[PDB]
Design a protein around this ligand. Structure first.
Ligand SMILES: Cc1ncc(C[n+]2csc(CCO)c2C)c(N)n1
Ligand SMILES: Cc1ncc(C[n+]2csc(CCO)c2C)c(N)n1
Ligand SMILES: Cc1ncc(C[n+]2csc(CCO)c2C)c(N)n1
Ligand SMILES: Cc1ncc(C[n+]2csc(CCO)c2C)c(N)n1
Ligand SMILES: [Ca+2]
Lengths: 182, 182
């Protein structure tokens, strides 16, 4: 039960290389297995650590002040899946370093519960949590819109993710998060 | 059954608004319904029309000569799919005969509510192999490489197959043009 996040940062600026490089290096990534490549970075580990590093990387990137987007896919429970491209063993190591950092996280996201006859209800559940949390804006074709500070939106995304995986063995969730837009 | 592609363009440049605008306006978008928002664009129509328009957007954006990413989700066969928001022939093929771009790609296919989904994902890697676009498998995705013509040919091929064998599929894609690491 290793959580995964494959994501990309997109700094809308000539200074893109440094923003990417710097968001990654600024994060405490000691609690996740990481691999950066030409297209994307992948984090693997426990849900806490994956989500913790995800929010962190997002907040560092956003605090560059450039218009940045984080776009990626959260995954857990894929059948097979090596027991070891991971860091094993509970603390949200990034929490402290980033509680003075804030950011807007307008977001479009999609929940994909796999091999799951009740996936429609699971997604319906996902919408309810977002509504309950106050982060939900609207539904659009193929996704749901969220808005709020990084902390509230990332809360919403994790709660949805946690809810659904409690129910189904294999789930993916895509997120598309925008910071520092006009 | 109506195909959809919800995607974003990420120009890693200061000139990005103008890059996004240009790529959408340069394309012949008359055979797909479209809606652009502060985060993403959705195209809805037939499979030929969705992929035809998607490829032409990619080509136009790449030919800005700037590092640009197209990142998005193809979707067909959604149970609660509305009948509106669609256009009722690959209209761009001519216009883009002259265009070329590299299209290195990480994609991932999600057959929904499908017990044999891993077999379908097996199949998809094989198509990429059959067409010579497959590079390797990575955690949570597969890597293609080639020119836009073959990479986009592969994706639609993968998408068509899956959509024939099961009812609701999603496919994410992350395509990178003009990277300075190349
Ligand atoms: C999270 C994250 N990982 C990798 C890339 C891809 N990428 C693009 S430019 C570049 C080089 C910067 O030194 C890299 C690694 C990305 N966009 N986002
Ligand atoms: C958070 C969330 N919002 C919307 C969708 C969109 N969506 C995709 S398939 C589907 C119908 C369920 O049978 C719906 C509503 C999603 N997946 N996840
Ligand atoms: C395909 C595409 N659709 C929308 C956006 C989002 N977006 C970001 S800045 C902007 C204003 C440009 O006129 C828009 C629409 C995108 N990045 N890519
Ligand atoms: C096109 C395609 N390539 C690779 C994966 C990745 N992947 C995800 S789970 C899994 C094992 C089978 O369930 C594999 C290979 C994908 N999803 N879609
Ligand atoms: Ca046009």
């Amino acid at each position: 039960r290793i959580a995964g996040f494959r994501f990309s940062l997109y700094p809308m600026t000539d200074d893109f290389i440094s923003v990417i490089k710097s968001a990654l290096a600024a994060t405490d990534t000691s609690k996740v297995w990481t691999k950066t490549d030409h297209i994307s970075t992948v984090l693997r580990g426990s849900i806490d650590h994956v989500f913790d590093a995800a929010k962190a990387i997002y907040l560092h990137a956003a605090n560059s002040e450039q218009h940045i987007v984080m776009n990626g896919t959260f995954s857990i429970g894929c059948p097979g899946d090596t027991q070891g491209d991971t860091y094993l063993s509970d603390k949200r190591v990034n929490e402290d370093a980033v509680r003075g950092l804030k950011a807007e996280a307008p977001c479009q996201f999609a929940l994909y519960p796999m091999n799951e006859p009740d996936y429609m209800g699971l997604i319906m559940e996902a919408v309810d949590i977002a509504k309950a949390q106050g982060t939900f804006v609207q539904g659009v074709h193929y996704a749901s819109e969220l808005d709020g500070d990084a902390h509230d939106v990332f809360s919403t995304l994790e709660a949805v993710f946690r809810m659904a995986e409690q129910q189904t063995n294999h789930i993916t969730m895509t997120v598309n998060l925008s910071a520092n837009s006009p």
